[PDB]
Amino acid sequence: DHYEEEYVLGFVDKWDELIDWESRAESEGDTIINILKERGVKKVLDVATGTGFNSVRLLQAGFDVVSADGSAEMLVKAFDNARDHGYLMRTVQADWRWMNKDIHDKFDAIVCLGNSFTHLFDEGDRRKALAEFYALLKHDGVLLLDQRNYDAILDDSKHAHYYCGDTVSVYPEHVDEGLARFKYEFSDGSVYNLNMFPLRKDYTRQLLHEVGFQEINTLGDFKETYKEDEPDFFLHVAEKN
């Protein structure tokens, strides 16, 4: 699918055109950075680099970072965004399903953020991806993996979620247990529609346990502009031991 990659490349361009990273950094806060700091983390592998926000935040924070993504095109955008923030990014093109094909080091932590794991629609692929991440971690390593709160949608909810003030709204057009389609509308009128797999919180936790992770703490993460009783995101902190 040539067009589908081009469609998503258009989407991330729009996201970064209209949402500046300083605002996003202020909002995210330093919870993730603090979690890594408290564990004495030095080497981090970003497996979902995208246009590089998480990686650049981590480089800025002083971590040694390897930035991987399945998409060469994303990595080019990430390297240039890093360059613009004054950092040399270490990029590696790699598919989650065979990560150690081109990555030969072990890491203190792996981050898989921005609701990325949701892009896998096959359960075999999910297991493989997690086993690949698990193998890339040092004995005392940690996996940080987030996701949208799909439970809230599946059990109720049919309204838009806004991010960075009203810069973008995210509306669930169709959600069932095998597929969520979101409409993203930006403040300039741009609309993009994206498919993803609606991971239940406990299903993700179960997968992490099943491939070998010893302890998993799931945190509620309220990112949206207009807060509800339920978090719109979950962050899983999975310790290899």
Helix (H, G, I), strand (E, B) or coil at 50: coil
Task: State the Cα–Cα distance between residues 223 and 234, nearest whole angstrom.
Answer: 10
Task: Give the total residue count for the chain.
Answer: 241
Judged by CB, which is closer to ligand SAH: 89, or 113? 113
Beta bridge partners of 46: 67, 111
Q: Could you say whether residue 232 binds ligand SAH (CB under 6 A)?
A: no
Closest CB 41 distance from ligand SAH, rounded Å = 18
Judged by CB, which is closer to ligand SAH: 3, or 155? 3
User: Binding site annotation covers 229?
Assistant: no
Q: Could you say whether residue 74 binds ligand SAH (CB under 6 A)?
A: yes
Q: Could you say whether residue 113 binds ligand SAH (CB under 6 A)?
A: yes
Closest CB 49 distance from ligand SAH, rounded Å = 6
Residues 70, 127, 131, 152: which binds ligand SAH (CB under 6 A)? 70
Task: Give me the residue label for tokens 């690949």.
Answer: 132
Based on the number of CB atoms within 10 Å of its own CB, is 165 exposed (0-12), middle (13-18) or buried (19 or more)?
exposed
Give the strand pairing for 191-196 and 64-69.
unpaired
Give the strand pairing for 179-186 and 161-163.
unpaired
Closest CB 119 distance from ligand SAH, rounded Å = 4
Contacts of 241 (CB under 8 A, 6+ apart): 139, 140, 214, 215
Closest CB 150 distance from ligand SAH, rounded Å = 16
- For 202, which DSSP code? H
Q: Could you say whether residue 53 binds ligand SAH (CB under 6 A)?
A: yes
In 104-178, at which residue ranges do the beta strands (DSSP E only) sit? Answer: 107-112, 137-148, 161-163, 168-176
Judged by CB, which is closer to ligand SAH: 48, or 180? 48
Choices 56-64, 114-122, 132-140, 147-155; region in contact with ligand SAH by CB under 6 A: 114-122
CA atoms within 13 A on the CB side of 206: 6
Closest CB 155 distance from ligand SAH, rounded Å = 26
User: Binding site annotation covers 57?
Assistant: no
Please give the annotated binding residues for S-adenosyl-L-methionine, written as ranges.
Answer: 24, 69, 95-96
Please give the annotated binding residues for S-adenosyl-L-homocysteine, written as ranges.
Answer: 24, 69, 95-96
Interface residues toward ligand SAH, by CB under 6 A: 48, 50, 53-54, 69-71, 74, 95-96, 113-114, 116, 119
